[PDB]
Write a protein that binds this ligand. Structure first.
Ligand SMILES: Nc1ncnc2c1ncn2[C@@H]1O[C@H](COP(=O)(O)OP(=O)(O)O)[C@@H](O)[C@H]1O
Ligand SMILES: Nc1ncnc2c1ncn2[C@@H]1O[C@H](COP(=O)(O)OP(=O)(O)O)[C@@H](O)[C@H]1O
Ligand SMILES: Nc1ncnc2c1ncn2[C@@H]1O[C@H](COP(=O)(O)OP(=O)(O)O)[C@@H](O)[C@H]1O
Lengths: 517, 516, 516
């Protein structure tokens, strides 16, 4: 009319309408998960493989939204993912509940400044009262079952069938390097995929693990310097066709002898300069393997971009895809390279640990390539959850037993200070009842009776609804002795990011115009 | 082709009312923010008046021309583009109502000019002086930050601004806003500010861990080819023979060796110990084999330097930029007192301070890696502009909506002359000045007429400058809290409003012609 | 069925503005007349307010209801239906503007009531008395005739009206407008008026040319059957035998002969000369053979008399109406002083005057045989009503637009209280009272704001009641020319306007229901 060119529908009326419906529709396609349930969703983009996923991270990473209100939350989601390990759907659910509860306050007839002030006061009160429900704590990280219980509790959120063997393997792989005290890195653990048997035959191994065959000889010396290259066995001599049937044998024999002499001089110069082995990334030839066998030089076969990228980012060399024989400028720190036979396959093992910065690589094996993705996701999630950078994790009884207590505390605190700030406090307290409802609705029973039962027992804060059929209607269980706890800092960061996103959404709300060319 | 009616004035009044109603919710500290996105999905957050008016798509030519005229008058004072369209729209509505009632635009223009002259005389007679110190500038910067940024980090910003102003201003001539560089970084926190009293160098050295406690240092700026590239070159044209290019490469290597030997002997002559350091700035690369031999004796050399860095270095210290490494007079070597190396991110920064004539202050700010850093920079720039405007003069009048009420009372009651034709315009000009307190009370969250009549009764009973409170809606005095303003800003705003309202009512007919 | 908006007030304001714009060019003596024709082509000229509002076809129900309410309050004073819709429309427009700005109708109603009370107090304190004589009534009648009829024949009617008022009023009790009969005739000229001090009889005698100089005459009113018809009758039922009806006719003739002999002997007994005359009034016919014998002795008998004629004769003189012609007491015979016979047209009229207690004045008017005679009659009736209204009281305030200016000045300047909410309504009530002088200046042919500010300056410099001149547009004093007004008329107009403006803004929603 005066600013927009019949593109958007913004103005002095979409404040309590279009700016909330988009977020509601975005969060509606996410409440189906959140909990140990089988709600797989197929993802079809560009790979054209038809794979089903369960986590919301891969679902949100493939969906393309064209709305600023929906794009204002993916930034906070990525920030929370970069900060701590888990935590993604909680922020979205909290923001959706806050928006749905503020829609009524905006429709009644209240300004946004009072609502923002009340939300900030409620968030400050929740942050102040949060360090008060600490029950269990981490004792010694040098044991096995102490971290195995936490790993099992973290894995049970994803996979429900098998969760003990994977947790034990992750614990054994993490305890063989360095604990949380001192310094512990994350990009020092690699996951390899082996197409063979099922998942009931996995093992662990310290050092580098790569599925690369060897058609030469076993070189177990320390002077075998590595030499990575792009495509050294490509084609230094391009041969063409003269006639149709065949040409003269003299020219072909001369060209073959010249190429053989050239490659012999090349391998002699590359072996006499201080490099016994060579990393190739091309094809093979009969004379090539013959020279590699008669010169005692290890020759690989399998080539991959990820392998050379990891070798470059770990050692620090540089591939030289040149025709003329260059000089030795790829000196690294590796020296102990051994060969092993695993699953009738030849694997390499690198030994260069000096009790500092050790690496590990767990051996994984499955049926198809569409099943190891969830295993790798669970493994990396458990690895990220194990890192907390503190000796005492100060675990709290998660699963919804603390949300009701926090809501009751906020409700009891709000019924004291007079003024027009009680409605926002009551809304922030009632918004905390969105975690048990989503967990009860995704099981098979209702959620009103579960909430009534949870509010009718006692204010102990250690009661939550179970997962079996004998724990849906009563929902009276003690999760303190079972071993179901959550991260203390994770919930705090999630609440902080949700409050920040809600404040940013409620602030920027007026007229959405365009920009001139 | 042929048109003889009054639809032009009607559509002009309609466009003015539309432009006034579009932008009217951005007044006062409790204003609502806006957003702009169109180019490849770039989310931009702003709240200023000129920044919004400069980056918008208006479908009306009259509104576009009005916005252009309003933006073309912002380069005089600091920030006066806001709180101007409302008074113009009110005056245009009053003029349209008086025309529909039955009058001539000439009498309206004469009355508007008389009212403008009376308001100028009242503002000149009501002004008052005040001794400029530290609390006044602190309050001015705090108000300028509150009118732009939220009331959370409006403390370390104004403190740093006042510190930089006190460190820069020390003479009698008017200061210049060209010696203060505002840089930006990328961190994880939000509130992170720093006031560096020296220069900032982005690049450093490729071989760190050698020394950093260099007190007295000599800096020399040059532009010779020390180590550009190891690739063979000639004269920008490829050849066929390799002997010539290899001889040229050997000659270049011999020249580089001669140059490094010359600078080594120069460092050994002008120093000879470890206290007096020698820092070299060069835009070309540095070979590590030569860098090690240089650092073995106690001279550091930096590579990859920008033009602005060496410009600021030669402007603050005072050195001659030559293209030779010969043994010349040490008069062009600048002195540095303290050098520090800050390691953060993927590149180490260099901070040089304790130099001669400290006339270079850096206001470093860090953000959470988003687009709010540009908003913080614009806010601190507006604050610096307001501080500079509040330091050139010596008279500061109170604000908070306490100048328009007295102006209207003086224009309505104490009439300069007795004339109905002049009063018909004086009343219209006085009734349009009350658009600021009403809009402020509406945006604060209270009534519009109750607070107005309360302020009127308070001013009629007491007689002082009564302001508007944005907390309880009660009439209070703005001369004891801390709300202040400027002097020439109000005069420029009144002049612009009168100029805009004058050259609008004289529009006769609008024909459809033209080709260019 | 379901409606929750504010369109009802909008359409009400629109209908009020339309009704105000439709009727607004009929104010002042220099107005434009109107014509109405629809039924069988009947041309009717009018210019009054109530006569127009009572005979119109309004398509809007709200306007029709407003007109009905305005006409229902016209039977109180003389003529106050005009100059009322303009102030109501102005007040409604001000209320709609204040509602669109943001206010409540309760505060507006309270302010309107306060302004009405202040105006009533000012009118009660500004009133002044004046001795009632002949010049004041003459000027009042002249102003009424000028406001009703043109400035031509407005000089021959005011004198007759004043003479009739002076002849009728002679006691202390309030006079009554029921003893003055306004008759009409048909002539060729236009300006022809007469003031008869006696009664008027339309019919006369069938045999004229006998006598007309009858001084002291005796009039006797009866209703016996003297000569109804020569046709044979019985008892309202036809029969078959002719002997019975012929005997009845013979008996009726004998009774008529006996009655005429009895009245002849009565006239001979009560008189016996030619000076003492006798006049008989009868509604039945008179035979010429008996009329000749009656006139031979000196007694006139009239035939075909109306009921109102004999009613006025028995009410002014005082006679008993009997149904017999016997010899009774002469106490019921009325006395007549002078009898005259006017011969004009196709029927001779009788004028009786010089009787006892002259309390019957006739205002005979003539026209050029058209429809303007009814307009002249309505104008003289309005003049008589204004004269009667100006004779009941003893205080007359000046007019010509000299009371609304002082009222507005007292309501704006000398405020009764200090309150913004009350002032918001006081200003709206005071700004709606200046529509009468503006409309008068617009209809006179001059400007609207120039004369307004001139009158304002003249009232502010001097301090007397300044009127509006309809000749040169210059401010003059209406207290020395001859322009006057009433007292209770202004109070009734203010009360009606307040009642109308009060019960309008309280309209919530208008639903579509009802069956009856
Ligand atoms: N076996 C379990 N018993 C009880 N609660 C569980 C179990 N597994 C997961 N949860 C609950 O489900 C919630 C969501 O877990 P998870 O999916 O790991 O995080 P996110 O939803 O942020 O991705 C957690 O707050 C946790 O309390
Ligand atoms: N601290 C304050 N308290 C009350 N009102 C203020 C304060 N600071 C500014 N204002 C009001 O804000 C108005 C101008 O705000 P704005 O249009 O944003 O320009 P600026 O940013 O230059 O103040 C002024 O009319 C003034 O009355
Ligand atoms: N002689 C006069 N000179 C000037 N104005 C007059 C005169 N007589 C009447 N008016 C004006 O006419 C108005 C009323 O006229 P009108 O509505 O026709 O009613 P009326 O016929 O009773 O006067 C009054 O407001 C008065 O100012």
């Amino acid at each position: 009319m005066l600013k927009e060119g019949a593109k958007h529908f913004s103005g002095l009326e979409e404040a309590v309408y279009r700016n909330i419906q988009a977020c509601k529709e975005l969060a509606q396609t996410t409440r189906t998960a959140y909990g140990p349930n089988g709600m797989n969703k197929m993802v079809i983009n560009h790979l054209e493989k038809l794979f089903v996923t369960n986590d919301a991270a891969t679902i949100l990473r493939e969906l393309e939204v064209q709305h600023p209100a929906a794009k204002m939350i993916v930034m906070a989601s990525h920030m929370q993912e970069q900060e701590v390990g888990d935590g993604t759907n909680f922020v979205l659910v909290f923001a959706g509940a806050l928006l749905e509860l503020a829609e009524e306050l905006l429709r009644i007839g209240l300004s946004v400044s009072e609502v923002i002030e009340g939300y900030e006061i409620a968030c400050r009160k929740a942050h102040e009262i949060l360090p008060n429900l600490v029950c269990c704590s981490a004792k010694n990280l040098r044991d096995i079952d102490e971290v195995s219980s936490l790993l099992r509790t973290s894995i049970m959120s994803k996979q429900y069938g098998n969760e003990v063997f994977l947790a034990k393997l992750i614990a054994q792989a993490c305890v063989s390097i360095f604990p949380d005290s001192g310094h512990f890195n994350v990009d020092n653990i690699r996951v390899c995929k082996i197409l063979g048997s099922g998942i009931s035959s996995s093992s662990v191994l310290h050092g580098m693990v790569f599925k690369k065959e060897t058609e030469g000889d076993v070189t177990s010396v320390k002077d075998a310097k590595i030499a990575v290259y792009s495509c050294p066995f490509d084609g230094m001599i391009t041969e063409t066709k003269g006639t149709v049937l065949i040409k003269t044998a003299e020219e072909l024999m001369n060209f073959s002898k010249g190429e053989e002499n050239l490659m012999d001089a090349q391998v002699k110069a590359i072996a006499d300069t201080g490099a016994n082995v060579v990393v190739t990334g091309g094809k093979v030839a009969d004379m090539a393997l013959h020279y590699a066998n008669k010169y005692n030089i290890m020759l690989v076969r399998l080539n991959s971009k990820w392998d050379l990228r990891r070798l470059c980012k770990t050692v620090g060399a540089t591939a030289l895809p040149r025709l003329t024989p260059p000089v030795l400028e790829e000196m690294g720190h590796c020296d102990s390279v051994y060969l092993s036979e695993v699953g009738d396959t030849q694997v390499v093992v690198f030994k260069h640990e000096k009790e500092d910065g050790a690496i590990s690589t767990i051996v994984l094996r499955g049926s198809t390539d569409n099943l190891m993705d969830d295993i790798e996701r669970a493994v990396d999630d458990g690895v990220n959850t194990f890192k907390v950078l503190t000796r005492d994790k100060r675990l709290v009884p998660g699963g919804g037993a603390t949300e009701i207590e926090l809501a009751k505390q906020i409700t009891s605190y709000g019924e004291t200070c007079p003024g027009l700030e009680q409605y926002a406090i009551k809304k922030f307290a009632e918004a905390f009842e969105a975690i048990p409802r989503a967990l009860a609705e995704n099981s098979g029973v209702k959620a009103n009776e579960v909430i009534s039962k949870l509010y009718a027992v006692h204010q102990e804060g250690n009661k939550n609804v179970g997962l079996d059929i004998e724990a849906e209607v009563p929902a009276v269980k003690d999760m303190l002795e079972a071993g179901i706890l959550d991260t203390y800092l994770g919930k705090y960061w999630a609440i902080k990011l949700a409050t920040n996103a809600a404040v940013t959404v409620l602030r920027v709300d007026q007229i959405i115009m365009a920009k001139p060319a | 082709e042929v048109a003889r009616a009054q639809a032009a004035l009607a559509v002009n009044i309609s466009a003015a009312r539309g432009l006034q109603d579009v932008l009217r919710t951005n007044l006062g500290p409790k204003g609502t923010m806006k957003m702009l996105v169109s180019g490849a999905g770039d989310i931009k957050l702003t709240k200023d008046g000129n920044v919004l008016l400069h980056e918008m798509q208006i479908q009306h030519p009259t509104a576009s021309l009005i916005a252009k005229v309003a933006t073309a008058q912002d380069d005089i004072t600091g920030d006066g583009t806001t709180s101007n369209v409302l008074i113009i729209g009110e005056l245009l509505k009053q003029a349209d109502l008086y025309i529909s009632e039955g009058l001539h635009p000439r009498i309206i223009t004469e009355g508007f000019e008389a009212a403008k002259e009376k308001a100028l005389q009242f503002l000149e007679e009501v002004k008052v002086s005040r001794e400029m110190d530290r609390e006044t500038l602190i309050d001015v910067a705090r108000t300028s930050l509150r009118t732009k940024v939220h009331a959370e980090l409006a403390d370390v910003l104004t403190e740093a601004v006042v510190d930089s102003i006190l460190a820069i201003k020390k003479q009698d001539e008017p200061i210049d806003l060209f010696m203060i560089e505002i840089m930006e970084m990328k961190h994880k926190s939000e509130t992170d500010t720093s006031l560096i009293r020296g220069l900032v160098l982005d690049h450093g050295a490729r071989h760190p861990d050698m020394k950093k406690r260099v007190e007295d240092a000599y800096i020399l700026t040059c532009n010779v080819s020390l180590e550009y590239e190891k690739t063979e070159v000639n004269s920008g044209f490829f050849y066929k023979s390799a002997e010539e290019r290899e001889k040229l490469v050997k000659a270049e290597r011999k020249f580089i060796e001669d140059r490094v030997k010359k600078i080594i002997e120069l460092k050994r002559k002008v120093c000879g110990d470890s206290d007096k350091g020698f820092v070299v700035i060069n835009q070309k690369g540095i070979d590590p084999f030569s860098l090690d031999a240089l650092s073995k004796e106690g001279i550091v050399a930096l590579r990859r330097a920008k033009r602005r860095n060496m410009e600021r270095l030669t402007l603050a210290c005072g050195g001659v930029a030559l293209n030779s490494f010969d043994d010349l007079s040490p008069d062009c070597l600048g002195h540095a007192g303290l050098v520090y190396e800050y390691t953060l991110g993927e590149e180490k920064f260099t901070f040089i301070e304790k130099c001669n004539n400290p006339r270079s202050v850096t206001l470093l700010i860090k953000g959470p890696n988003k687009h709010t850093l540009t908003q913080i920079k614009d806010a601190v720039r507006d604050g610096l502009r307001a501080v500079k405007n509040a330091i050139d003069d010596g008279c500061v009048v109170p604000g908070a909506g306490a100048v328009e009420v007295a102006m209207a009372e003086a224009l309505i009651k104490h009439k300069p002359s007795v004339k109905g034709r002049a009063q018909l315009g004086v009343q219209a000009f006085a009734d349009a000045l009350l658009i600021i307190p009403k809009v402020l009370a509406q945006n604060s969250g209270f009534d519009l007429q109750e607070t107005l009549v309360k302020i009127q009764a308070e001013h009629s009973e007491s007689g002082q400058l009564v302001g508007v409170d944005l907390n309880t809606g009660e009439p209070m005095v703005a001369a004891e809290v801390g709300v202040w303003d400027n002097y020439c800003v109000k005069k420029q705003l009144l002049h612009s409003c009168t100029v805009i309202a004058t050259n609008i009512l004289l529009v006769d007919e609008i024909m459809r012609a033209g080709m260019s």
